[PDB]
Amino acid sequence: RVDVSLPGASLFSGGLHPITLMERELVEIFRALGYQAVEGPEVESEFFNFDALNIPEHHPARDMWDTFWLTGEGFRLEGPLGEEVEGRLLLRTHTSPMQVRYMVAHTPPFRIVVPGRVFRFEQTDATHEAVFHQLEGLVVGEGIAMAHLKGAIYELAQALFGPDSKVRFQPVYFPFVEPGAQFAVWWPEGGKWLELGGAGMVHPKVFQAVDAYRERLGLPPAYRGVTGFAFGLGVERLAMLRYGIPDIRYFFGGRLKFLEQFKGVL
């Protein structure tokens, strides 16, 4: 005979990382609203991470970002046009610089969503990491308004949580956005308000910064008569609610017994 239940040639089954799944659903969701996804460098200049986003030196707004400062000689940190950029080096504290980046290299109107690994000098506990992921949004063009920001988030929420879901917007402060705002989503099987991310209408001084950088690069102004809305949305938090993960520290851990648990998901 040939015992037909007898285990077969055990080949390797691959899998994706929790964050990858979550990042994916995220971009998939936004690309159906016409957002295209681009990435940026993890090692950034202070000019892109801070100055171009209206976060100035010795300003009390920089305390929202506990920053890793890097040193090192002979390291080409390439700018939006591949030009060699100078400036005091650091690790991205948010993906936000990518939108100054992108705006210099392209022209309105556009929709983009940018994922990335981001860094903060913070104490690794169970609901906090020193290294985690953000997903940015930027929609710039003539006529764009805050109604469209709300619309986007409303759309995000509908897709991540179903019809029984609703979104909440509250004023809050970011230097690179005014009117600024924090947004929360209502998740039915939890009866809970999720603080998801921050957002707003991209700040006049940001547009100014990019058009200025443009000139230095010899490019034409492109952001004098357009408006925009950006948002920043933290991904681990969201992945935790979705896959039911009790501890953020797991993501960076390497535990196969952990990773393997996600082979199924789609």
> DSSP assignment, residue 87?
S
H and E: helices and strands count for the chain: 7, 11
| Among positions 50, 231, 251, 262, the unique one binding ligand DAH when judged by CB under 6 A | 231
Q: Tell me whether residue 177 is one of the annotated catalytic residues.
A: yes
Q: Does residue number 212 form part of the binding site for a copy of itself (CB under 8 A)?
A: no
Q: Annotated catalytic residue: which of 202, 230, 235, 239? A: 230
Report the nearest approach of a copy of itself to the CB of residue 27 (Å).
Answer: 11
* Known active-site residue 237: no
Q: Does 27 bind a copy of itself (CB under 8 A)?
A: no
Strands 177-187 and 167-171: antiparallel
Q: By CB under 8 A, tell whether 225 contacts a copy of itself.
A: no
Q: In three state form, how does the secondary structure of 222-264 look?
A: CCCCCEEEEEEEEHHHHHHHHHCCCCHHHCCCCCHHHHHHHCC
In terms of residues, how long is the chain?
A: 266
Among residues 31, 230, 206, 264, the alpha carbon closest in space to that of 139 is found at 230
Distance from the Cα of residue 207 to its chain's centroid: 19
Q: Is 208 annotated in the active site? A: no
Active site residue 134: yes
* Token pair for 34: 């016409």
**Beta carbon of residue 163, minimum distance to a copy of itself (angstroms, whole number):** 13
| 177: amino acid identity, one letter | V
Smallest separation, CB 118 to ligand DAH (Å): 7
Taking CB under 6 A as the rule, does residue 144 contact ligand DAH? Answer: no
16, 27, 33, 245: residue in contact with a copy of itself (rule CB under 8 A): 33
* Single residue of 32, 70, 212, 217 touching a copy of itself by CB under 8 A: 32
List active site positions. 65, 94, 120, 134, 177, 230
Name the residues that contact a copy of itself, by CB under 8 A. 31-34, 36
